[PDB]
Amino acid sequence: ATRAIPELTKLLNDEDQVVVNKAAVMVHQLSKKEASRHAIMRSPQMVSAIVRTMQNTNDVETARCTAGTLHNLSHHREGLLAIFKSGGIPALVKMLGSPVDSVLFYAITTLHNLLLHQEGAKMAVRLAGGLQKMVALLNKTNVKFLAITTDCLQILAYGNQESKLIILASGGPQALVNIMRTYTYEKLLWTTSRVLKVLSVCSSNKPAIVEAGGMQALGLHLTDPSQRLVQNCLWTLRNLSDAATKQEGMEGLLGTLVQLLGSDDINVVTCAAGILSNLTCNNYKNKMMVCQVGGIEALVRTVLRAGDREDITEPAICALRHLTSRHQEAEMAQNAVRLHYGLPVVVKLLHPPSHWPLIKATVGLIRNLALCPANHAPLREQGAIPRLVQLLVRAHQDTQRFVEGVRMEEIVEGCTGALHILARDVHNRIVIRGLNTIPLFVQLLYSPIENIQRVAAGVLCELAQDKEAAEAIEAEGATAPLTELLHSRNEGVATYAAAVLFRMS
């Protein structure tokens, strides 16, 4: 082994322009034999001459035979340490701009092997400007090469907000989204989705990914037989979904997310419910398409199937809340929840062991369902009013004296808001009045939150249309605060306060 070796090493070590071409091909033949290859290592001047000549040469093969070696030393744990000591990482990064496809494949594979097994390689690649060189290579068309490059990006970007921002400034988001819409190679698509997943938690990369059409691109692979690709797409879709409210062309994605609600895998259902909940927030167009593809019917079945798991019911109720208000077919959606046996389970979610986030969403859903007169009776028979009164009284006591991410003022306003809509029915008014709620409604007029005064005065206005209730509202001393509420900056508070005062006289 170390026979010719020390002699062979000296033949490239002398170097120069005529010898390097023959010394590069010969060290490549020596790298092809494992014996010598082991000897090629352990010689610092040899490995350091392979990398040095690689960045200086300009011939036709230039880096091929030299990088051909370091491709083979990269297979050895000792060779990975050798390339690390030789300073090949900055030079291999320099070859990420080389024109030859051979060196590009050999350089990206050597850095890849270094990034997986060589300690301190991630930091050295960053210092050499490798991140920018790798993002610029995303315009290639060889999927095997693109899979190796994106994996390096995921290795470097994971747990490194610095690297995520550098990828952003290099046009990473748009380049990675293009790979999603162009190729079908599962290994490349899965790895590219892993990079986009790591980028989607960054507040700066999330809008840029959304603007690049990432939501539509990720939706193309939601029907792929590879569960790891669909699950990674769904995780990335849920991260970006809060910033995708202005996106169009979502008809195909929204239809597939509805189908995924029937899946047996909880992570698929949990994500699809969360994405639909975010995409339907303040988007009447998305509310319409989701309703047209049977989204109400699918979300009720999902809430029924879920039961106790709040990771599914909380987003599914939130989506059901969005779909039942403020769009053209909202009235049909409020009827649809009833027709699909949804009213019993919705009122059930108001009771323990439900937590405050799910209870908050469920109250907002009941407020929207109560807008449909055909829901006034069944919501009463299911016991919605007595539970909503108990939630309102308890949340108001906590206010006078953030529980799981929910301020109790939101429960006060939501419960009083739902009761305001339910009070339109005359039988609900008897139930609401029989619970001695007027003394609390009058007290709610003094609340500092204007939105609480609005629903408090509105529900008092609905009750005051009966003489017995109007007389009771007067006996509660409600004339005094309603007089001050006539000067409210909120237009709704002033109009409701005038309606109760007129009915009292």
Side-chain angles (χ1 to χ4, degrees), residues 306-325:
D308 313 59
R309 36 208 66 160
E310 291 180 358
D311 39 339
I312 301 163
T313 48
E314 195 272 331
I317 288 311
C318 271
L320 271 177
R321 171 200 55 210
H322 299 155
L323 299 174
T324 51
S325 88

Side-chain angles (χ1 to χ4, degrees), residues 12 47 79 90 182-183 195 213 234 248 311-312 336 365 384-385 430-431 465 498 500 504:
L12 177 63
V47 194
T182 305
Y183 303 101
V195 186
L234 283 168
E248 306 221 356
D311 39 339
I312 301 163
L365 175 57
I385 289 167
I430 288 168
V431 184
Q465 77 183 283
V500 198
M504 260 150 45

